[PDB]
Design an enzyme around this catalytic site. Structure first.
Site, short mmCIF file in Angstrom:
data_model
loop_
_atom_site.label_atom_id
_atom_site.label_comp_id
_atom_site.label_asym_id
_atom_site.label_seq_id
_atom_site.Cartn_x
_atom_site.Cartn_y
_atom_site.Cartn_z
N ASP A 8 0.87 -1.15 0.00
CA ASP A 8 0.00 0.00 0.00
C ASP A 8 0.91 1.21 0.00
OD1 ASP A 8 -1.72 2.18 0.50
OD2 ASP A 8 -2.35 1.41 2.46
N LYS A 69 2.23 11.30 -4.15
CA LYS A 69 1.09 10.66 -4.74
C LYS A 69 0.13 11.64 -5.41
CE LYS A 69 -1.99 6.97 -3.71
NZ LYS A 69 -2.26 5.96 -2.67
N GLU A 173 -6.82 0.32 -4.59
CA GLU A 173 -6.83 0.21 -3.12
C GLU A 173 -8.15 -0.34 -2.57
OE1 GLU A 173 -5.79 4.13 -2.09
OE2 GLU A 173 -3.90 3.88 -3.16
N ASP A 197 -12.86 5.06 2.88
CA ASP A 197 -11.40 5.15 3.05
C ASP A 197 -11.01 6.55 3.48
OD1 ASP A 197 -8.62 5.18 2.91
OD2 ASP A 197 -8.60 3.94 1.09
#
Ligand SMILES: [Cl-]
Ligand code: NA
EC number: 3.6.4.10
Length: 382
Positions: A8, A69, A173, A197
């Site tokens: 992850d 990211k 994810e 999330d």
């Protein structure tokens, strides 16, 4: 080839697991931590990755890169890059159309494409894996957000390649978290899985439909600038106000003090997920003045009540976009440490009229867990 791992590669934190002897071991890093800040810092003498990097951000803000990211797979001209840049203390420069984070490292101006930064975090994940396993680790499943486009996925693969990983597969994810819970082991009719999330920095609501081990992303919603850090921040301001009343000092412009308060708040938030009181224990917060205080869970929730309530808006948007009623969700999977917050769980269960949440796998490890499961399958060991 040895064991394949699942990674992850998170906006704020990363996590690596390995499926071994019928179970996922989440691999603690060289600091004994089961997640690793997605941070890289550059000092006069070294490249710091992960905890070391995060831990010195306040000391070294312009050369401590995070949120890579947010840049990965993007071009400089991108409105998202332009907007985000406005809130990073490190530089982002245009290299012939592509963004490069620019830092000082061993006193030289050095610039890195986002995937180079991310490869460093992946190199760390690979190293802590090898340290734990005592064997070479070459093969990895790496996860990405479901909204990632081709450019963003290729750039993430590029990060893996740079890190010397054979990236077996780029997996979404939300999909990873579903695999973690074995929701794709199910046989029969389509299941609609809502992945809620709520990470450190980003809030993603994804609705997947899973049928015969096959995933479809139905909708994605969220807030790319809402996470656990926002809740920490409401506590920071609260404790800044308290410090001001008790000590008649305003610590606001002291970045180190604010940072150590922030860290204490971040730990307090975590503590408050299991207990009703958490302490803030800071020796010499500001001008040598200690700050030992504490906060109830109730006060924490109060400080954040609007933001907690606000997490339901993307749930409703995801549901609208998926053309699903809240009642059509078979599984709610909690991902991200903030999802451990009892109030958020209660708001979510309340919204879902009492439905119990999939939360047995540490929400922070669920994605790497699922990635590790998938890696073991893709390398032929499950
Ligand atoms: Cl994260
Ligand atoms: Na997280």
């Amino acid at each position: 080839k040895g064991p394949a791992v699942g990674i992850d590669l998170g906006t704020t934190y990363s996590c690596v697991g390995v499926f071994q002897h019928g179970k996922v071991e989440i691999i603690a890093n060289d600091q004994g931590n089961r997640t690793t800040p997605s941070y890289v810092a550059f000092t006069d003498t070294e490249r710091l990755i992960g905890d070391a990097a995060k831990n010195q951000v306040a000391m070294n803000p312009t050369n401590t890169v995070f949120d890579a990211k947010r840049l990965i797979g993007r071009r400089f001209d991108d409105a998202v890059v332009q907007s985000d840049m406005k809130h990073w203390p490190f530089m982002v420069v245009n290299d012939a159309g592509r963004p490069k984070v620019q830092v000082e490292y061993k006193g030289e101006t050095k610039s890195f494409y986002p995937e180079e930064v991310s490869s460093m975090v992946l190199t760390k994940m690979k190293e802590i894996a090898e340290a734990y396993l005592g064997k070479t680790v070459t093969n990895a499943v790496v996860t990405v957000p479901a909204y990632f486009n081709d450019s963003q996925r290729q750039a993430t693969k590029d990060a893996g390649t740079i890190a010397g990983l054979n990236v077996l597969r780029i997996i979404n994810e939300p999909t990873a978290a579903a695999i973690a819970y074995g929701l794709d082991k199910k046989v029969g009719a389509e299941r609609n899985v809502l992945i809620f999330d709520l990470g450190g920095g980003t809030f993603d609501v994804s609705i997947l439909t899973i049928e015969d081990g096959i995933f479809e992303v139905k909708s994605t919603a969220g807030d790319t600038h809402l996470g656990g850090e926002d809740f920490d921040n409401r506590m920071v301001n609260h404790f800044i106000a308290e410090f001001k009343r008790k000590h008649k000092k305003d610590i606001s412009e002291n970045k180190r003090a604010v940072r150590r308060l922030r860290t204490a708040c971040e730990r307090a938030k975590r503590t408050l997920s299991s207990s009703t009181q958490a302490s803030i224990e800071i020796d010499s917060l500001y001008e040598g003045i200690d700050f030992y205080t504490s906060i109830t869970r109730a006060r924490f929730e109060e400080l954040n009540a609007d933001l907690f309530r606000g997490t339901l808006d993307p749930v409703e948007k995801a549901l609208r976009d998926a053309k699903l009623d809240k009642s059509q969700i078979h599984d709610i999977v909690l991902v991200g440490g903030s999802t451990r917050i009892p109030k958020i769980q209660k708001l979510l269960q309340d919204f879902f009229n009492g439905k119990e949440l999939n939360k047995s796998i540490n929400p922070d490890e669920a994605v790497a867990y699922g990635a590790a499961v998938q890696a073991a399958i893709l390398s032929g060991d499950k």
